[PDB]
Write a protein that binds this ligand. Structure first.
Ligand code: ZN
Lengths: 123, 114, 122, 207, 56
RNA sequence: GGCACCUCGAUGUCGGCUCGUCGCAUCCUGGGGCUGUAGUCGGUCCCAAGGGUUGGGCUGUUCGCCCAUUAAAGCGGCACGCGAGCUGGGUUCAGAACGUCGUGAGACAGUUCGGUCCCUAUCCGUCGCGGGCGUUGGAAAUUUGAGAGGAGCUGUCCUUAGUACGAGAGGACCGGGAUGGACUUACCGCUGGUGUACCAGUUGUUCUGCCAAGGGCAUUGCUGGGUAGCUAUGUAGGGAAGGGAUAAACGCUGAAAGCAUCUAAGUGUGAAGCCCACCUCAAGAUGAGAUUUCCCAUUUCUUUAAGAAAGUAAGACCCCUGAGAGAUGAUCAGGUAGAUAGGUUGGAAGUGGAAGGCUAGUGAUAGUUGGAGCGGACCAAUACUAAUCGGUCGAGGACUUAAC
RNA sequence: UCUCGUUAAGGAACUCGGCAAAAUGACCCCGUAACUUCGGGAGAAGGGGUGCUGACUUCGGUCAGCCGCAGUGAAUAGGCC
């Protein structure tokens, strides 16, 4: 593994990054956080493939509690809390694809620190 | 790992019954005096287990004349003739280290008829 | 692992109760001592009566350490205490009764007059 | 004389015929082709080249496959020599199975030590720290560097620098089994090297 | 301690020789023939592996 | 002790700590001669520096007295070794007191209590690790050993034998065998330690609308276990046996000196010491070594010379996935001719009985569905993701003489 | 190098000197010496209990039962002679 800070700070940083990239399917950050987050995200999508209680109540600790995602209305305001998304949209979208569902792209360093940045996608 | 197992099957004794830490166990050891071969009888409480394959081990905790004693044996010895569970006790830990500070009427474990 | 300035116990009917080691005879600077190795100690506490008293220099032997020897087969012994049994330079004890088990490793050292008195020889 | 290379798998135990556990490591091996015979009249001494593993084909170059193919094998990974062996008795392209060490019982394994990176001057020499309290400030350092008169530092004062990574041999170890059907030896004791390293075993030197 | 002399003009260079700055790994892109860094997304073309990536 | 050449634009004292090193006028082990040496012990002298030479009590202590061991508890040099490496206790600041001296302010190698020790390594030096070039065509590998380093310690028991010895008393040389002490080289299968992205219990308080289930914070909240990795007090081995030339000493043969006499000519024995034997580094050994295999030729002329330039072979490097390696660089495993890492499906170590239900209870809770649920580094299997496309460098082999 | 956490067996052998760390630490109950200026020493020493559920609560608490290795379960909070 790769530490960046103390323990609990790293845990919170990952529980942050993998909650985006659930909502946007794309993210532009550095190189190391990329590798650790691809591991974590792929490990938190197999839980989207069981869909029962126990997988629900185990996934429900590695996701920022409530982060709305609303692009829908029929005559209503439907709200999707970025976990319900995990169990409603990403899940049924990977049934036949087995492990390994993220792409990492090495783009270009940054202005102030020359930290070689990177992208992350899903298909 | 797989290449060793194939090298270490012919020496795995195969009559050891089931017993999890917390079961009184009588152990028929093997002793050697002069040119004889007696058979001792160490008999206590199973305390430990080092899950290892060929080299799993266990320990027993007797109390003789007010002085605790412990012996640990390899699980696959040829110099142990037999083992025989006697009871079964309610217990919630996998390492009962917390006994060495308890005496008599406080270090008893409830029985289970199973 | 029993070295200088450490406290054994008397497992005998000789008159002493505690003890504090002095040396680990045998070698030219040895540190420790295990089951069945001789020792030089001087009484610290004592019961009234007895042939042994405070401030006496005596030799003793180590029975049942708290990290016991290994058996050549692959088993171990690990008691709960340490203890010693006083001696007269001829492997012959002074007291006339022994309490508490003793480990087997004495039979290999001509300490016979002891084992014939131990209630349990583990 | 009797020489075999091989890998290093790990360690386990084994009971002997008298109820006595024995630590034992697992030197694995495979057949291996003698590659070249060096003679007095051509190379100044007598020795034998050997090699214990099989490369792919992508991972070599025309010199290697032109130096091996005089014995018709796949190109090898390791290549070593041996001396004091009764030469005779041999051919280009023969083999050396694990048979030669039936119960030789005396053998001198060599190999390459582990690796431990830049290290202090205590994990390399057993030098003792200074009093960690009573107001001192000399916990973990390499001592003094010598006297004053010579106005220089004598050779062989020992201080920090990479630890481990150089070869070393042990002597007078036994052998316990030879499972020719799988090409595995089993010796008594600890043997140096990391897992999957390269090991060599020859007969004893001290008779 | 503290220097016991000024360093000559020569020693200054003879020590600075190993103070360089090399750039490495420059490739010709495949859609615009311009120089790009191997294993890296083309900044001007936007493409990679003959495919477009940077799009929305 | 003497002298006052040396240092006043400042050359810091004793002991103890870490670290050594050298001389022998030798403390133990090794070889010897003489004895007022029966034996076991011993006395002295000679050769010999290879290794080894302890824990603690009392004082600031060197010094010393004492206790307990051991083969032995050596003497000295190195700014009475070592403070830009440590301590500052001691003697030498400002406070204060006792005894004595001085009318006094103060003093006393007399005593008692307290008291500030700074420094970011430039050069050489030592420990490790890279880049450049050389070795006369360009490359991939395997080795010889001129030299250098390491290592060298020793007890106890049994048998030989209750013999030789001796009145008894007591008790061997030379041999054979077993097992220890200290020291030291490697490793994690056993016993143990650690193990902050592993498992369980439990307090407070706050958050996810509430009950149920969970997160946040409190030294990782505290407590009980613990995988891989790194580890010693754990495991395994080591100083074995020999050779050659010598030291003190002992001869053989033999004269100068019809004898005697180891010596001048001749010829031997002889020690932990010298040189080999054991382990490691080593061709920048510019006296730059040896062997196996691989790759074989354009343009103008400077003028044909050891000419200049361009494109290639063998190969190497750049770039990317990594670790059995790692401060960076290096070494090693791989780069679609693919298991290098991630992921996925199994499996193991490890915890120790998941959630949701149901039965028994008024309730705490208990039983059952089930060796369950979870499971970082470990073992297998699979190209789902990423090692794409690419680029740079890299020879065309001088002369003289002999032989063939 | 500094600031922290853990440790087998031994427990002052370190050291000028237990300096530094470790150990005790809350509330309720029992009990407590020499010595004395009679006020004190005295929180002397040395010991016991604490969680949850139900019943009875005269009032304080008493009974019964349940679980854990550990019940002021974390932080705060005299070492003694
Ligand atoms: Zn482009």
């Amino acid at each position: 593994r790769k530490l960046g800070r103390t323990s609990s700070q790293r845990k919170a940083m990952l529980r942050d990054i993998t909650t985006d990239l659930i909502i946007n399917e794309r993210i532009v950050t550095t190189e190391a956080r990329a590798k650790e987050v691809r591991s974590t995200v792929e490990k938190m999508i197999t839980l989207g493939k069981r869909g029962d209680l126990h997988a629900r109540r185990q996934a429900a600790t590695f996701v920022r509690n409530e982060v709305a995602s609303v692009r829908e209305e029929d005559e209503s305001i439907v709200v999707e809390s970025a976990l319900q998304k995990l169990f409603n949209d990403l899940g049924p979208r990977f049934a036949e694809r087995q492990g390994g569902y993220t792409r990492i792209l090495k783009t270009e360093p940054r202005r102030g620190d020359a930290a070689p940045m990177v992208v992350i996608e899903f298909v | 790992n797989p290449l060793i197992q194939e090298l270490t099957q012919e020496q795995l004794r195969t009559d050891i019954p089931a017993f999890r830490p917390g079961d009184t166990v009588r152990v028929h050891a093997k002793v050697v005096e002069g040119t004889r071969e007696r058979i001792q009888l160490f008999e206590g409480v199973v305390i430990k287990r080092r899950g290892a394959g060929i080299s799993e081990t266990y320990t027993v905790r007797k109390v003789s004349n007010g002085v605790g004693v412990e012996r640990t044996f390899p699980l696959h010895t040829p110099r142990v003739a037999q083992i025989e569970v006697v009871r079964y006790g309610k217990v919630r830990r996998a390492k009962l280290y917390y006994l060495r500070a308890l005496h008599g009427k406080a270090a008893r474990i409830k029985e289970i008829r199973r | 692992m029993i070295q200088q300035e450490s406290r054994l116990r008397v497992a005998d009917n000789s008159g002493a109760r505690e003890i504090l080691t002095i040396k680990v005879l045998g070698g030219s600077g040895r540190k420790t001592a295990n089951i069945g190795d001789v020792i030089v100690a001087t009484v610290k506490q004592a019961t009234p009566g007895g042939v042994v008293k405070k401030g006496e220099v005596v030799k003793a032997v180590i029975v049942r350490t708290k990290s016991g020897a290994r058996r050549a087969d692959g088993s171990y012994i690990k008691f709960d205490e340490n203890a010693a049994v006083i001696i007269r330079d001829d492997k012959s004890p002074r007291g006339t009764r022994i309490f508490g088990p003793v480990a087997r490793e004495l039979r290999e050292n001509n300490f016979m007059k002891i084992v014939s008195l131990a209630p349990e020889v583990l | 004389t009797k020489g075999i290379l091989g890998k290093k798998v790990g360690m386990t135990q084994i009971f002997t015929e008298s109820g006595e556990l024995i630590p034992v490591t697992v030197v694995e091996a495979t057949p291996n082709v003698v590659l070249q015979v060096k003679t007095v009249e051509t190379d100044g001494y007598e020795a034998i080249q050997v090699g214990y593993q099989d490369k792919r084909e992508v991972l070599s170059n025309k010199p290697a496959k032109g130096h091996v193919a005089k014995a018709n094998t796949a190109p090898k990974r390791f290549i070593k020599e041996f001396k004091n062996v009764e030469l005779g008795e041999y051919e280009v392209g023969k083999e050396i199975k694990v048979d030669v060490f039936q119960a030789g019982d005396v053998v001198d394994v060599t190999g390459t030590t582990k690796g431990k990176g830049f290290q202090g001057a205590i994990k390399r020499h057993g030098q003792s720290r200074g009093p960690m309290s009573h107001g001192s400030r000399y916990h973990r350092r390499p001592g003094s560097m010598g006297p004053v008169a010579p106005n220089r530092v004598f050779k062989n004062k020992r201080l920090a620098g990479r630890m481990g990574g150089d070869r070393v041999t042990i002597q007078n170890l036994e052998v316990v089994k030879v499972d020719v059907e799988r090409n595995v030896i089993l010796i008594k004791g600890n043997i140096p090297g990391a897992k999957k390293s390269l090991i060599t075993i020859k007969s004893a030197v001290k008779a | 301690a503290v220097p016991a002399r000024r360093t000559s003009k020569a020693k200054k260079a003879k020590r600075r020789t190993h103070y360089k700055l090399t750039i490495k790994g420059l490739n010709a892109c495949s859609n615009c023939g311009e120089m790009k860094k191997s294993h890296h997304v083309c900044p001007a073309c936007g493409h990679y592996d003959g495919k477009d990536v940077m799009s929305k």
